[PDB]
Design a protein around this nucleic acid. Structure first.
Length: 296
RNA sequence: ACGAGAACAUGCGCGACAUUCCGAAGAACGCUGAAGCG
């Protein structure tokens, strides 16, 4: 049951990737899945159903005109335009797979992206000033979406799983996503509806397969899938965000996952991984795979 | 169990000091209290 979820962000969002200064326009599926898990914990909702039966897609840009998917990692027989071309409208993406997209149209598609503007807020901490100290400045990354634009993701699951996702997203609207939430950022409104277009892209048969979410297979699946693939291996690191985990905040175990949009000739099922070390509760990372079939 | 959790772009700071709306300039030029004589 593929459901399109569209997030329109009222206030700017941080969506940090490596620091507080930098801001990402989107987030990977692991971040959204962690937010869903946190929300289910707050709402006293079971985690097993969400962990097992739910496979979600990375968040991707969309405008009033087009919904943008990640550029597939396929061989190109100029190249700077394709490097600049990160997202392709779904109708254009099938043409890109067919290889009809030239460099000029690639640059035109890349400039067509009007997701929003990335800024940097400069803030201070005045806590030391009271205790005979000096204030200290810092910076928070931000990304403000244009009024028509927003982010979206596709989620597949059982009917009960979809309803639980609806409730969790209704709560996440006010909980927020990204960094420096509960400090002025990350507030969004969500709308979940079935999308015929996405279902048409979902149902497809091709020689090649492309990830829609950041994922990594188990070793047994890795042996078969790794061969004949073009992928980007991205590191997923972070600090645990919980009160129950430890007395003081502890970093998560470093993970490495195939970036969304990577092309595998052999598909692999995803696995929910545990990046906890010596903690009171296991810290979950989402590495399940959302697949699109294409022909090159 | 969102490169995350706290974290005020903030504190002290007078739009202020020096300045004459003055300088030059005749209310004066011409002008019969007078004409006819009933």
């Amino acid at each position: 049951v593929v459901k399109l979820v569209k997030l329109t962000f009222k206030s700017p969002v941080h969506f940090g990737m490596k620091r507080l200064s930098d801001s990402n326009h989107t987030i990977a599926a692991d971040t959204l899945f962690s937010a869903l898990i946190i929300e289910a914990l707050q709402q006293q909702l079971e985690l097993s159903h969400l962990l097992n039966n739910l496979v979600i897609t990375d968040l991707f840009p969309y405008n009033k005109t087009s919904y943008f998917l990640p550029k597939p990692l396929i061989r190109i027989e100029g190249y700077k335009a394709f490097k600049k071309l990160t997202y392709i409208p779904v109708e254009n993406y099938s043409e890109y797979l067919r290889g009809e997209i030239d460099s000029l149209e690639a640059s035109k598609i890349a400039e067509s992206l009007n997701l929003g503007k990335a800024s940097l807020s400069t803030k201070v901490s005045l806590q030391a000033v009271d205790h005979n100290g000096e204030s200290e400045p810092y910076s928070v990354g931000n990304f403000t979406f244009y009024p028509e634009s927003g982010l979206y993701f596709l989620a597949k699951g059982n009917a009960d799983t979809i309803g639980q996702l609806e409730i969790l997203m209704h709560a996440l609207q006010y909980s927020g996503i990204g960094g420096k939430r509960s400090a002025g950022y990350g507030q969004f409104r969500c709308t979940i509806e079935d999308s015929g277009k996405f279902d048409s892209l979902l149902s497809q048969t091709g020689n090649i397969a492309i990830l829609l979410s950041s994922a990594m297979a188990s070793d047994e699946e890795l042996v078969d899938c790794l061969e004949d693939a073009r992928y980007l291996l991205k590191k997923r690191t972070g600090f645990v965000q919980s009160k129950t985990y430890a007395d003081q905040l502890v970093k998560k175990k470093d993970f490495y996952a195939f970036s969304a949009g990577s092309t595998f000739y052999q598909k692999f099922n995803g696995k929910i991984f545990d990046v906890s070390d010596n903690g009171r509760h296991s810290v979950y990372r989402y590495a399940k795979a959302f697949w699109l079939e294409g022909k090159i």
